[PDB]
Scaffold this active site. Structure first.
Site, short mmCIF file in Angstrom:
data_model
loop_
_atom_site.label_atom_id
_atom_site.label_comp_id
_atom_site.label_asym_id
_atom_site.label_seq_id
_atom_site.Cartn_x
_atom_site.Cartn_y
_atom_site.Cartn_z
N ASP A 142 -0.64 -7.29 1.91
CA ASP A 142 0.01 -6.00 1.96
C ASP A 142 1.50 -6.21 2.20
OD1 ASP A 142 0.29 -3.26 1.88
OD2 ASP A 142 -0.60 -2.88 3.84
N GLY A 198 2.63 6.40 8.72
CA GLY A 198 4.06 6.60 8.54
C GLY A 198 4.91 5.43 9.04
N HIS A 221 0.82 -1.22 0.00
CA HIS A 221 0.00 0.00 0.00
C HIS A 221 0.85 1.27 0.00
CE1 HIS A 221 0.10 0.56 4.55
NE2 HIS A 221 0.19 1.80 4.12
N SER A 267 3.87 2.29 8.42
CA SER A 267 3.55 1.19 7.50
C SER A 267 4.81 0.68 6.84
CB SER A 267 2.60 1.66 6.41
OG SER A 267 1.37 2.12 6.96
N1 LIG Z 1 -1.76 0.40 14.45
C1 LIG Z 1 -2.72 1.26 14.13
N2 LIG Z 1 -3.72 1.48 14.98
N3 LIG Z 1 -2.70 1.92 12.97
C2 LIG Z 1 -1.77 1.80 12.00
O1 LIG Z 1 -0.80 1.06 12.02
C3 LIG Z 1 -1.98 2.68 10.83
N4 LIG Z 1 -2.87 3.68 11.00
C4 LIG Z 1 -3.12 4.53 10.03
CL1 LIG Z 1 -4.33 5.78 10.44
C5 LIG Z 1 -2.46 4.45 8.81
N5 LIG Z 1 -2.72 5.31 7.73
C6 LIG Z 1 -3.90 6.18 7.69
C7 LIG Z 1 -4.47 6.28 6.27
C8 LIG Z 1 -4.91 4.92 5.74
C9 LIG Z 1 -3.78 3.90 5.63
C10 LIG Z 1 -2.38 4.50 5.43
C11 LIG Z 1 -1.81 5.31 6.59
N6 LIG Z 1 -1.55 3.46 8.64
C12 LIG Z 1 -1.28 2.58 9.63
N7 LIG Z 1 -0.35 1.61 9.39
#
Ligand SMILES: NC(N)=NC(=O)c1nc(Cl)c(N2CCCCCC2)nc1N
Length: 246
Positions: free
Chosen positions: A97, A196, A46, A198
Protein backbone atom coordinates in the site's frame (compact mmCIF):
# COMPACT_ATOMS: atom_id res chain seq x y z
CA UNK A 1 -6.17 11.20 14.46
CA UNK A 2 -7.98 9.94 17.54
CA UNK A 3 -6.67 11.82 20.56
CA UNK A 4 -3.29 13.50 20.29
CA UNK A 5 -2.93 17.24 19.83
CA UNK A 6 -3.58 19.86 17.20
CA UNK A 7 -0.46 21.05 15.46
CA UNK A 8 0.59 23.25 12.59
CA UNK A 9 2.55 22.40 9.49
CA UNK A 10 5.85 23.79 10.89
CA UNK A 11 5.95 20.72 13.16
CA UNK A 12 5.53 18.27 10.28
CA UNK A 13 6.65 20.31 7.27
CA UNK A 14 6.92 17.23 5.00
CA UNK A 15 3.19 16.61 5.37
CA UNK A 16 1.31 16.71 2.06
CA UNK A 17 -2.45 17.25 1.79
CA UNK A 18 -4.01 15.44 -1.19
CA UNK A 19 -7.40 16.40 -2.66
CA UNK A 20 -9.56 15.25 -5.59
CA UNK A 21 -11.66 17.39 -7.89
CA UNK A 22 -15.05 16.00 -8.83
CA UNK A 23 -16.87 16.40 -12.19
CA UNK A 24 -19.33 18.55 -10.27
CA UNK A 25 -16.44 20.92 -9.59
CA UNK A 26 -16.30 20.30 -5.82
CA UNK A 27 -12.97 19.37 -4.20
CA UNK A 28 -12.70 16.88 -1.38
CA UNK A 29 -9.91 15.65 0.85
CA UNK A 30 -8.46 12.25 -0.10
CA UNK A 31 -5.40 11.34 1.99
CA UNK A 32 -2.11 12.53 3.46
CA UNK A 33 1.35 12.02 2.00
CA UNK A 34 4.98 12.95 2.74
CA UNK A 35 7.46 15.01 0.73
CA UNK A 36 10.59 12.92 0.15
CA UNK A 37 12.23 15.16 -2.47
CA UNK A 38 11.23 18.44 -4.09
CA UNK A 39 9.21 16.76 -6.89
CA UNK A 40 7.98 13.62 -5.07
CA UNK A 41 5.29 12.89 -2.50
CA UNK A 42 4.86 9.37 -1.13
CA UNK A 43 1.45 8.08 -0.04
CA UNK A 44 -0.75 4.91 -0.04
CA UNK A 45 -2.08 3.23 -3.22
CA UNK A 46 -5.53 2.53 -1.67
CA UNK A 47 -6.06 6.25 -1.67
CA UNK A 48 -6.16 6.46 -5.44
CA UNK A 49 -7.04 3.02 -6.68
CA UNK A 50 -10.71 3.87 -7.31
CA UNK A 51 -9.94 7.10 -9.19
CA UNK A 52 -6.59 6.54 -10.73
CA UNK A 53 -6.56 9.48 -13.09
CA UNK A 54 -3.75 11.80 -12.10
CA UNK A 55 -5.56 14.83 -13.49
CA UNK A 56 -8.20 14.77 -10.83
CA UNK A 57 -5.77 15.35 -7.98
CA UNK A 58 -4.40 18.38 -6.22
CA UNK A 59 -1.55 18.33 -3.74
CA UNK A 60 -0.79 21.03 -1.18
CA UNK A 61 2.36 21.51 0.82
CA UNK A 62 2.74 23.90 3.76
CA UNK A 63 -0.95 23.56 4.58
CA UNK A 64 -2.18 23.45 8.24
CA UNK A 65 -5.95 23.62 7.65
CA UNK A 66 -8.27 21.48 5.58
CA UNK A 67 -10.57 24.01 3.92
CA UNK A 68 -8.78 27.32 4.26
CA UNK A 69 -5.50 28.48 2.85
CA UNK A 70 -2.42 28.59 5.02
CA UNK A 71 0.03 31.42 4.48
CA UNK A 72 3.04 30.13 2.51
CA UNK A 73 1.33 27.05 1.07
CA UNK A 74 2.09 25.67 -2.41
CA UNK A 75 -0.43 23.95 -4.70
CA UNK A 76 0.49 21.30 -7.28
CA UNK A 77 -0.95 19.22 -10.09
CA UNK A 78 0.04 15.56 -10.26
CA UNK A 79 2.43 15.00 -13.16
CA UNK A 80 2.78 11.27 -12.45
CA UNK A 81 0.64 9.00 -10.27
CA UNK A 82 2.53 5.76 -9.60
CA UNK A 83 0.65 2.97 -7.83
CA UNK A 84 2.33 -0.22 -6.69
CA UNK A 85 1.73 -3.00 -9.22
CA UNK A 86 1.51 -5.70 -6.50
CA UNK A 87 -1.16 -3.86 -4.53
CA UNK A 88 -3.92 -6.00 -3.21
CA UNK A 89 -6.65 -5.78 -0.74
CA UNK A 90 -8.47 -8.20 1.58
CA UNK A 91 -11.54 -7.09 3.64
CA UNK A 92 -9.06 -5.56 5.96
CA UNK A 93 -5.43 -5.65 4.89
CA UNK A 94 -3.91 -3.62 2.17
CA UNK A 95 -0.73 -5.14 0.75
CA UNK A 96 1.96 -3.07 -0.95
CA UNK A 97 0.00 0.00 0.00
CA UNK A 98 2.42 2.59 -1.33
CA UNK A 99 2.17 5.22 -4.06
CA UNK A 100 4.27 8.03 -5.52
CA UNK A 101 3.01 11.36 -6.78
CA UNK A 102 5.28 13.54 -8.90
CA UNK A 103 4.18 17.06 -8.27
CA UNK A 104 4.22 19.98 -10.62
CA UNK A 105 2.85 23.47 -10.24
CA UNK A 106 0.91 25.37 -12.96
CA UNK A 107 4.21 27.17 -13.68
CA UNK A 108 5.97 23.80 -13.85
CA UNK A 109 7.95 23.92 -10.67
CA UNK A 110 8.36 21.49 -7.82
CA UNK A 111 8.35 22.36 -4.07
CA UNK A 112 10.55 25.16 -2.74
CA UNK A 113 11.61 24.36 0.80
CA UNK A 114 10.69 26.89 3.48
CA UNK A 115 9.84 27.00 7.19
CA UNK A 116 6.56 25.22 6.32
CA UNK A 117 7.81 22.92 3.50
CA UNK A 118 10.66 20.41 4.00
CA UNK A 119 11.55 16.88 2.92
CA UNK A 120 11.61 13.89 5.27
CA UNK A 121 14.48 11.40 5.18
CA UNK A 122 13.93 7.82 4.12
CA UNK A 123 15.16 4.99 6.35
CA UNK A 124 18.15 2.77 5.57
CA UNK A 125 17.10 -0.56 4.14
CA UNK A 126 15.61 -3.05 6.59
CA UNK A 127 16.50 -0.58 9.40
CA UNK A 128 13.58 0.03 11.77
CA UNK A 129 13.46 1.23 15.38
CA UNK A 130 13.00 -1.43 18.08
CA UNK A 131 9.52 -2.32 19.31
CA UNK A 132 8.35 0.06 22.05
CA UNK A 133 9.93 3.06 20.29
CA UNK A 134 7.70 6.14 20.24
CA UNK A 135 6.93 7.60 16.81
CA UNK A 136 4.69 10.40 15.53
CA UNK A 137 1.73 10.25 13.16
CA UNK A 138 0.10 13.24 11.47
CA UNK A 139 -3.10 13.83 9.53
CA UNK A 140 -6.51 15.42 8.91
CA UNK A 141 -8.30 12.11 9.60
CA UNK A 142 -11.28 11.66 11.89
CA UNK A 143 -11.04 12.61 15.59
CA UNK A 144 -13.61 10.00 16.54
CA UNK A 145 -14.64 6.92 14.59
CA UNK A 146 -18.28 8.13 14.67
CA UNK A 147 -17.51 11.63 13.30
CA UNK A 148 -18.87 12.54 9.88
CA UNK A 149 -16.51 15.49 9.52
CA UNK A 150 -12.74 15.65 9.38
CA UNK A 151 -11.01 18.23 11.62
CA UNK A 152 -10.26 21.59 10.05
CA UNK A 153 -6.90 21.76 11.84
CA UNK A 154 -3.97 19.34 11.36
CA UNK A 155 -3.37 16.87 14.21
CA UNK A 156 -0.58 14.67 15.43
CA UNK A 157 -0.05 12.06 18.09
CA UNK A 158 2.44 9.55 19.43
CA UNK A 159 2.17 5.79 19.11
CA UNK A 160 4.60 3.01 20.05
CA UNK A 161 5.88 0.40 17.61
CA UNK A 162 4.53 -3.09 18.24
CA UNK A 163 6.51 -6.28 17.57
CA UNK A 164 5.50 -8.48 14.65
CA UNK A 165 5.05 -11.30 17.19
CA UNK A 166 2.53 -9.26 19.15
CA UNK A 167 0.72 -7.88 16.09
CA UNK A 168 0.40 -11.36 14.50
CA UNK A 169 -1.45 -12.86 17.47
CA UNK A 170 -5.02 -14.04 16.56
CA UNK A 171 -6.64 -11.51 18.82
CA UNK A 172 -4.78 -8.75 17.07
CA UNK A 173 -4.45 -9.27 13.28
CA UNK A 174 -3.05 -12.77 12.67
CA UNK A 175 -1.63 -13.32 9.19
CA UNK A 176 -3.11 -10.02 7.95
CA UNK A 177 0.03 -8.22 9.11
CA UNK A 178 3.09 -9.14 7.03
CA UNK A 179 6.79 -8.33 7.21
CA UNK A 180 6.18 -5.48 4.75
CA UNK A 181 3.95 -3.86 7.41
CA UNK A 182 4.56 -2.32 10.85
CA UNK A 183 2.05 -2.02 13.68
CA UNK A 184 1.92 0.83 16.14
CA UNK A 185 -0.37 1.68 18.98
CA UNK A 186 -0.97 3.37 22.31
CA UNK A 187 -0.66 1.19 25.49
CA UNK A 188 -4.13 2.37 26.58
CA UNK A 189 -5.44 2.28 22.97
CA UNK A 190 -6.48 5.89 23.53
CA UNK A 191 -4.93 7.57 20.46
CA UNK A 192 -4.51 6.27 16.88
CA UNK A 193 -4.74 7.01 13.19
CA UNK A 194 -8.13 6.74 11.53
CA UNK A 195 -9.98 7.12 8.24
CA UNK A 196 -8.61 10.16 6.41
CA UNK A 197 -5.10 9.70 7.87
CA UNK A 198 -4.16 7.09 5.23
CA UNK A 199 -1.09 7.90 3.18
CA UNK A 200 0.35 10.09 5.96
CA UNK A 201 3.67 9.75 7.78
CA UNK A 202 4.74 7.59 10.68
CA UNK A 203 7.95 9.36 11.72
CA UNK A 204 10.58 7.96 14.08
CA UNK A 205 13.96 9.24 15.23
CA UNK A 206 16.52 6.83 13.82
CA UNK A 207 20.23 7.27 14.06
CA UNK A 208 19.68 10.88 15.23
CA UNK A 209 17.39 11.66 12.34
CA UNK A 210 13.62 12.13 11.80
CA UNK A 211 12.85 9.33 9.37
CA UNK A 212 9.80 8.15 7.42
CA UNK A 213 9.41 4.73 9.03
CA UNK A 214 5.83 4.08 7.94
CA UNK A 215 2.84 5.16 5.85
CA UNK A 216 -0.66 5.00 7.40
CA UNK A 217 -2.39 2.10 5.66
CA UNK A 218 -5.14 0.31 7.63
CA UNK A 219 -6.71 -0.85 10.81
CA UNK A 220 -9.84 -2.46 12.20
CA UNK A 221 -11.70 0.59 13.39
CA UNK A 222 -9.69 3.23 15.24
CA UNK A 223 -8.23 3.31 18.79
CA UNK A 224 -9.84 -0.07 19.47
CA UNK A 225 -8.34 -2.41 22.03
CA UNK A 226 -6.06 -5.04 20.42
CA UNK A 227 -6.32 -3.43 16.97
CA UNK A 228 -3.19 -1.41 16.24
CA UNK A 229 -2.66 0.95 13.36
CA UNK A 230 -0.93 -0.78 10.47
CA UNK A 231 1.63 0.98 8.36
CA UNK A 232 3.47 0.20 5.15
CA UNK A 233 7.05 -0.59 6.22
CA UNK A 234 9.00 1.95 4.14
CA UNK A 235 12.40 0.31 4.82
CA UNK A 236 11.19 -2.70 2.73
CA UNK A 237 10.35 -0.61 -0.37
CA UNK A 238 13.53 1.42 -1.03
CA UNK A 239 14.31 -0.22 -4.40
CA UNK A 240 10.73 0.40 -5.54
CA UNK A 241 10.92 4.02 -4.34
CA UNK A 242 14.32 4.61 -5.97
CA UNK A 243 13.33 2.90 -9.21
CA UNK A 244 10.24 5.09 -9.63
CA UNK A 245 11.90 8.38 -8.57
CA UNK A 246 15.32 8.21 -10.33
N1 LIG B 1 -5.10 2.89 12.87
C1 LIG B 1 -6.33 2.40 12.75
N2 LIG B 1 -6.88 1.72 13.75
N3 LIG B 1 -7.03 2.59 11.63
C2 LIG B 1 -6.61 3.23 10.52
O1 LIG B 1 -5.52 3.74 10.36
C3 LIG B 1 -7.61 3.32 9.43
N4 LIG B 1 -8.88 3.02 9.79
C4 LIG B 1 -9.86 3.08 8.90
CL1 LIG B 1 -11.46 2.64 9.55
C5 LIG B 1 -9.62 3.47 7.59
N5 LIG B 1 -10.62 3.52 6.60
C6 LIG B 1 -11.93 2.87 6.79
C7 LIG B 1 -12.43 2.25 5.48
C8 LIG B 1 -11.48 1.17 4.97
C9 LIG B 1 -10.08 1.68 4.64
C10 LIG B 1 -10.00 3.16 4.25
C11 LIG B 1 -10.33 4.18 5.34
N6 LIG B 1 -8.35 3.79 7.25
C12 LIG B 1 -7.34 3.75 8.14
N7 LIG B 1 -6.09 4.08 7.72
Amino acid sequence: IIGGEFTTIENQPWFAAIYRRHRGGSVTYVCGGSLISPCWVISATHCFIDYPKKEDYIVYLGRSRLNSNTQGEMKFEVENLILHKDYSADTLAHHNDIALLKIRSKEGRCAQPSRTIQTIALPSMYNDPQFGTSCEITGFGKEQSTDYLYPEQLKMTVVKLISHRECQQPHYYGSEVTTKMLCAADPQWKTDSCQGDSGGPLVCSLQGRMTLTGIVSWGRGCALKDKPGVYTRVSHFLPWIRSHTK
